[PDB]
């Protein structure tokens, strides 16, 4: 009956011991990420929990079920953050991105809600100033809540990504050797990593500014840790190794250039300049001044360390003592005018999403994914459809 829709629906939204169980344990914790090379996905196949949450929340606000919606959203926030926190392994990149979408979606909705409450005259005019004050306070608090959530999951995810990159890229970039015609992670693993991030953020309709931020952060991180690994290497810094490093770095730069990134070079600067230092001739004082010209991001002390641990090969002229003396004199000169290491950016970072104009919210169609095992939620949505038809 149409006479008993909103009634039953009400009695469904009033029970936050059943609904909370299905939502937090079934929908959120029991989430399934869709398939992303070139695979096209409609926006409805990605942010389905966001859509469902938006439906339940909207219908709760319609019926004035305030405290219940507050508990609901509290447990939802806690659950989402917990889920992102427990992310590990091969699913780190897609799942993360997945949630980064959903949360963002939610945020937009709330913004819209607030922008409806304050702009549209009908709301401020149609109800008491006390109730209006309550709703404004509530919705605002929720907006800030989701802001904080997105910040949290972004920084958590990014920190995890860094924790894996530290485990792969050191050996891949510094130690791994693969040159054309000269004959346990490689550069291909790194490229596969960054490609995973790209295709995931692309197929899941994520704003490119976030991609820019993430990859820039990760690149700077790689640059830092690999440089801090290289400078303490000894019986290792040879011309061949400089060539190899230059090769790997060049691969990364190529990926950046062919995937939108313009500022990919400045991130890897220390490694580039390091390879250049290891490759160029360093036999004359002029060659050293040239080296200073090229390596602008490298400090004189770092130059001294790098040069002093260079490995001269067989049939290669060793670096003169006059040169080393000149280097020490330069370092002394710089001391007359704080460590040789680079401090890696571990976090926290500014949420890139908090710098982008929030997505304009459009009307969500009443739908719940058929493959889910959430009875109450499905009954809710099904009722909501008939409700909208009625209005």
């Amino acid at each position: 009956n149409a006479t008993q829709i909103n009634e039953e629906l009400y009695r469904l939204l009033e029970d936050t011991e059943i609904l909370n169980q299905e939502i937090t344990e079934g929908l959120l914790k029991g989430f399934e990420v869709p398939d992303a090379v070139a695979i096209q996905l409609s926006k409805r196949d990605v942010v389905y929990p966001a859509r469902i949450l938006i439906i339940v929340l909207s219908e709760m606000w319609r019926f004035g079920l305030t405290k219940q919606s507050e508990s609901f959203l509290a447990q939802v926030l806690t659950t989402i953050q917990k889920v992102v926190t427990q992310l590990k392994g091969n699913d780190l990149i897609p799942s993360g991105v997945f949630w980064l979408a959903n949360v963002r979606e939610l945020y937009s909705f709330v913004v819209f809600a607030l922008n409806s409450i304050l702009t549209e005259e009908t709301f401020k005019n149609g109800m008491t100033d006390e109730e209006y004050k309550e709703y404004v306070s509530l919705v605002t608090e929720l907006k800030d809540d989701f802001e904080a959530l997105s910040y949290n999951i972004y920084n958590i995810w990014l920190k995890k990504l860094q924790k894996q990159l530290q485990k792969k890229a050191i050996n891949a970039v510094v130690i791994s050797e693969s040159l054309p015609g000269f004959s346990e992670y490689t550069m291909d693993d790194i490229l596969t990593f960054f490609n995973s991030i790209y295709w995931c953020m692309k197929s899941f309709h994520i704003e490119n500014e976030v991609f820019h931020a993430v990859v820039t952060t990760l690149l700077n991180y790689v640059d830092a840790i690999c440089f801090n690994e290289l400078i303490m290497k000894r019986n290792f810094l040879s011309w061949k190794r400089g060539l190899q490093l230059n090769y790997n770095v060049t691969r990364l730069e190529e990926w950046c250039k062919t995937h939108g990134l313009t500022d990919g070079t400045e991130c890897l600067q220390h490694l580039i300049q390091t390879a250049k230092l290891l490759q160029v001739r360093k036999y004359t004082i002029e060659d050293i001044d040239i080296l200073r010209g090229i390596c602008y991001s490298l400090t004189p002390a770092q130059l001294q360390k790098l040069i002093s641990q260079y490995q001269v090969a067989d049939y290669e002229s060793p670096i003169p003592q006059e040169i080393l003396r000149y280097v020490a004199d330069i370092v002394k000169k710089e001391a007359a005018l704080s460590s040789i290491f680079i401090t890696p950016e571990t976090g926290p970072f500014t949420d890139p999403f908090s710098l982008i104009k929030t997505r304009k919210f459009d009307q969500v169609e009443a739908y719940i994914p058929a493959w889910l095992s959430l009875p109450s939620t499905k009954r809710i949505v099904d009722l909501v459809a008939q409700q909208v038809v009625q209005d």
């Binding site: 606000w61 409450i117 109800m127 008491t128 969500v364 909208v388």
Partner: peptide, 15 residues
């Protein structure tokens, strides 16, 4: 007197 908050967020389309 609570007017409630009916943000018409939800739509329905039939092919």
């Amino acid at each position: 007197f609570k007017k409630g908050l009916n943000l018409h967020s939800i739509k329905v389309t039939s092919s």
